[PDB]
Enzyme design. Structure first.
Site, mmCIF file in Angstrom:
data_model
loop_
_atom_site.group_PDB
_atom_site.id
_atom_site.type_symbol
_atom_site.label_atom_id
_atom_site.label_comp_id
_atom_site.label_asym_id
_atom_site.label_seq_id
_atom_site.Cartn_x
_atom_site.Cartn_y
_atom_site.Cartn_z
ATOM 1 N N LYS A 1 0.780 -1.183 0.163
ATOM 2 C CA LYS A 1 0.107 -0.199 -0.130
ATOM 3 C C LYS A 1 0.751 1.404 0.120
ATOM 4 O O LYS A 1 0.284 2.304 -0.443
ATOM 5 C CB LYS A 1 -1.166 -0.099 1.177
ATOM 6 N N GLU B 1 6.006 -5.540 8.962
ATOM 7 C CA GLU B 1 5.386 -4.853 7.901
ATOM 8 C C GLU B 1 5.768 -3.494 7.566
ATOM 9 O O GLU B 1 5.026 -2.696 7.793
ATOM 10 C CB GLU B 1 3.667 -5.068 7.780
ATOM 11 N N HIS C 1 0.362 -2.670 15.147
ATOM 12 C CA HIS C 1 0.686 -1.627 14.295
ATOM 13 C C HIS C 1 0.896 -0.308 15.526
ATOM 14 O O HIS C 1 -0.221 0.004 16.119
ATOM 15 C CB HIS C 1 0.050 -1.220 13.186
#
Lengths: 454, 454
Positions: free
Chosen positions: B116, B311, B238
């Protein structure tokens, strides 16, 4: 603020076919119809566009109509796309109705549709078939208008951007367009150097800060135009939607008349008057604005030697769309004691359980709902559907970004997974500025004709 | 605020490779390299990507390097695109160096690049050649990763979206990817019913409104997973792009260990630890973050049974791009007496003449510069190229929207039509979320390699 949810704010939250027919009848007013087509060719062309995109004539308020269409098309989609994917319901008959309204209210003004509002091919095709002019702010839009053969001659295209790039000017001159808009002498130099066939139009400031020459510097603009052998034959102004005072239009027209006199003092015989866009596209209504504009135009530009045009954008495509969203994820979160006290006094939500219901829909701020920031818009979320109590909700987008927050801690009926969200009046600068973030997009479209033409 | 122009704020404003080479030297750490390739195959693959995309090796500070490249690739266009068009300078060598830095700092963690951040095919292909995992938040990104055959098996893809659509889950199960992320019990039910061959990973909240299960609700998450026969073997979190300090990382990893103990109590043996992204990509440095988070991983997940993954998004593609813009239109305006007084006390530009300078560039808020709102970013405008007096400038965009302004009423060197604006560090969420309003887009791309691996 955020997306408008005033439809659900209290505890007891429960509870122009004749105009178009008149429009397609001329061939009323002593002014010639728009476009090069005759009366019979326009109707044939609009029916041809309808057949080409295979729109469906679903004759009918507006919220009830949109809800009925949403139910029908959701059921149809359940039975190249997924049934849970977002989709639009483009009402191409609304564009025709808006054109009929413009012809009825302002027969002396030929609209030049702003392609930037929505570059969707279907609306461009139907508008060209209706006889509308076209308003291209870039070489790309010029190519879409010309590439689709929507205009017989490039004389129906205005390079309405008052600040154009050099390559854009080269392409426009090569393509054969003539009408351009100017605000500074440097643009006069650029236009003279790179496009000698232009018919420059001066853009005058209105009572924003990006475009429009001040009334004092229009004399220097005319001097630069005369020095650079630039043919000036028009004056334009755009006020934008948001000016609540109806006197802004008449003041701008008076300034345009003064600029016309100044140009006459410079040996320029202007023949084009452009009043810009910003007209309301939803039901200060358009009728009041037209009733204000008409008399000053009659008593100031009523000679007949000056053609009055316009570039209405969202006016044509405001009520033509309706976006549908599916809630596919939900969770509940506890609330702090401090936040509990504030909500109990104001919100009508039952604060016995400090629960925040969060929902996720498949269209967010990185897409069609980008109008919250770019357009400063507040669309109306509508849940199509056992008491559904009012919980505080935070409707998120599909993107993993935390800012995709089309709603934030506001009362709303209880929603479960699989329900649909209907957003009426979602056609102005919605899919034009939409970005392809995370790969999500409202690719599916549905074509409906509220009016009957074929 | 707005775009950072602190480079020009006072009156007188005048005046790696070894680590990458070490990275391709596995056949020093007890952890196997990432990817299914070997040392002799990763270099061949990255050189193949460089040959495929015609990457040119440019060798050398970062600002001076970017200025040199901008001069070289700007006096190269007038010699399928217009010379006055915006363009990027993608430095894939920076992506390679970021990967090598990650391998050096965190050898025990295999990154799974967030597609993304930039779905650009070149960066995905070079990262796959480097051995990176992939992080797809939608079925589209899954198809781009699989369609290009970047991964040998779908086990190198994580459906990192904690809230996934039903069609996305169906496509993921059909494709063959196994790893998913969950936040709420409803997602447990959806995954169990739709993606039987899954390895759910619980997303825990970090000291967060949209994603991340609270530490108290992880009990209900585990109960739902066991009830719905869902196999969970990982816990993810996250933090966000910017936060207080590394104490957030320490708290998050301790909470992850607590959740691991809870899952072990709930008859669940986990083997995956995902620490999310949010690491700094530009030069709280990444080295300090790694030095903080390494010992806790060593003393908590040092048994070797659990594989630690990540990530990281903008970390790889932060310092890779460099947008360039052309000033094609300009004008000068007046200032009010009240506004004149304010600038005299604070602005260093002499306010003897109330001069307001408004410039126009070919990339605005509806495009690559959309990161100002969607990301809360303040990129550093740099004028590439007599005297350059400071003036009250307002650098607009190419779009005819009034709000398309990247800098408003701030001091800046005097600019003329033809100069270029270099915007370094414009690779994170710039072209991914970029729209197509008005038809303007930065289509031209130029490929450079700071490192020399070929």
């Amino acid at each position: 603020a955020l997306c408008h949810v005033s439809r659900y704010n209290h505890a007891n939250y429960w509870a122009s076919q004749d105009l178009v027919d008149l429009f397609f009848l001329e061939g009323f007013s002593p002014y010639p119809i728009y476009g090069w087509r005759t009366a019979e060719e326009r109707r044939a062309a609009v029916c041809e566009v309808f057949k080409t995109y295979n729109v469906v004539t679903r004759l009918p308020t507006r919220e009830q109509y949109w809800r009925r269409l949403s139910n029908l098309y959701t059921q149809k989609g359940v039975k190249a796309y997924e049934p849970e994917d977002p989709f639009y319901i483009i009402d191409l008959g609304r564009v025709v109705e808006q054109m009929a309204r413009w012809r009825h209210e302002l027969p002396m003004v030929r609209p030049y549709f702003a392609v930037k509002s929505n570059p969707q091919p279907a609306v461009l095709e139907v508008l060209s078939a209706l006889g509308a002019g076209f308003d291209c702010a870039s070489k790309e839009e010029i190519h879409m208008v010309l590439g689709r053969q929507l205009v017989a001659s490039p004389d129906d295209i205005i390079f309405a951007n008052p600040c154009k790039q050099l390559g854009d000017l080269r392409e426009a001159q090569a393509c054969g367009v003539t009408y351009v808009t100017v605000d500074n002498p440097l643009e006069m130099e650029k236009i003279s150097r790179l496009m000698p066939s232009a018919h420059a139009i001066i853009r005058i400031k209105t009572n924003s800060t990006k475009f429009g020459a001040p009334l004092e510097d229009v004399e220097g603009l005319l001097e630069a135009a005369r020095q650079f052998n630039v043919t000036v034959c028009g004056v334009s102004f755009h006020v934008g939607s948001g000016n609540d005072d109806q006197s802004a239009y008449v003041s701008a027209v008076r300034d345009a008349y003064q600029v016309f006199q100044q140009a006459v003092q410079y040996g320029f015989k202007c023949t084009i008057l452009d009043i810009g866009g910003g007209f309301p596209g939803t039901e200060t209504s358009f009728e009041a604005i037209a009733r204000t504009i008409r008399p000053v135009l009659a008593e100031l530009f009523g000679g007949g030697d000056v053609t009055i045009i316009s570039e209405p954008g969202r006016y044509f495509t405001a009520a033509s769309h309706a976006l549908l969203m599916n809630v596919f994820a939900s969770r509940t979160l506890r609330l702090s004691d401090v936040e509990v006290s504030r909500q109990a006094f104001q919100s009508v939500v039952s604060m016995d359980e400090p629960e925040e219901y969060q929902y996720y829909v498949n269209d967010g701020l990185y897409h069609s709902f980008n109008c919250i920031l770019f357009d400063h818009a507040h669309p109306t979320l509508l849940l199509l559907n056992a008491r559904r109590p009012l919980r505080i909700t935070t409707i998120f987008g599909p993107t993993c970004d935390s800012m995709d927050c089309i709603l934030k801690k506001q009362p709303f009926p209880e929603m479960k997974l699989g329900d649909w969200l209907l957003v009426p009046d979602m056609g102005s600068y919605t899919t034009a500025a939409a970005g392809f973030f995370n790969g999500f997009a409202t690719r599916r479209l549905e074509w409906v004709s509220s009016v009957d033409l074929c």
